[PDB]
Design a protein around this ligand. Structure first.
Ligand SMILES: Nc1ncnc2c1ncn2[C@@H]1O[C@H](COP(=O)(O)OP(=O)(O)OP(=O)(O)O)[C@@H](O)[C@H]1O
Lengths: 109, 103
């Protein structure tokens, strides 16, 4: 993680870096992500959890994500943490049902 | 129309005016985040009056609400709604004191 942070700060062509930490449930992922973020010093850090998109409606969620991403494009350096990605896109394995608009937006973003 | 009278006095007297108060209740019912409607008209009309091209420093506006994380993000910038405070439920000493004052 430290290596990636260092590259993202001082480079010329790498202007967008993603990652994906996956593992068995209960393995303690979100803590590790936050720890990797907290030892960077970036001016702008923000987090999106299901706890804040609680009890809203779908359109509200899309609007909220839009606003967050918009705010991410007005400062030199930034970091951004996203949790679960199968809970924002409400996933129930029988049928199987889920919501498509949110997924498509996240894939484009 | 809520700012007319105070404004008149500021123009007349100057810096020797008398304080005015405006109490707002349920601030979370109309002033919601502007996205990308009537709501936007309301938000803009309030924004341009709280602090606009014309200086006005003989006023004090208090606001009361039950959900503090839904007001637009531009109404909470140093200069418009500066100090934010929380009211808890009374503790035991609070109840004793309340009893003292009421009885
Ligand atoms: N490297 C670590 N060392 C010690 N404790 C850790 C470590 N990583 C996580 N934890 C502990 O894990 C707990 C929180 O778990 P956390 O929410 O990160 O799990 P999770 O993988 O996100 O869970 P879930 O899949 O159920 O959403 C805390 O008590 C934290 O101290």
């Amino acid at each position: 993680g430290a290596r990636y942070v260092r590259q993202v700060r001082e480079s010329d062509k790498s202007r967008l870096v993603s990652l994906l930490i996956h593992g068995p449930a209960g393995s303690g992922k979100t803590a590790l992500a936050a720890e990797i973020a907290l030892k960077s010093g970036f001016p702008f850090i923000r987090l999106i959890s299901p706890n804040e998109l609680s009890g809203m409606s779908e359109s509200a969620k899309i609007a909220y994500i839009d606003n967050t991403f918009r705010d991410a494009y007005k400062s030199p350096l930034n970091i951004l943490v996203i949790d679960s990605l199968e809970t924002l896109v409400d996933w129930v394995p029988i049928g199987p049902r889920f919501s498509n608009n949110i997924l498509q937006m996240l894939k484009v973003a | 129309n809520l700012f007319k009278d105070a404004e008149a006095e500021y123009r007349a007297k100057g810096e020797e005016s008398s304080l005015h108060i405006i109490i707002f209740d349920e601030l979370d019912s109309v002033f919601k985040q502007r996205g990308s409607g009537v709501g936007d008209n309301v938000v803009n009309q309030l924004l341009a009056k709280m602090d606009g091209v014309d200086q006005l420093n003989n006023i004090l506006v208090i606001g009361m609400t039950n959900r503090k994380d839904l007001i637009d993000s531009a109404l909470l910038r140093p200069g418009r709604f500066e100090v934010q405070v929380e009211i808890h439920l009374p503790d035991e000493k609070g109840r004793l004191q309340i009893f003292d004052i009421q009885t």
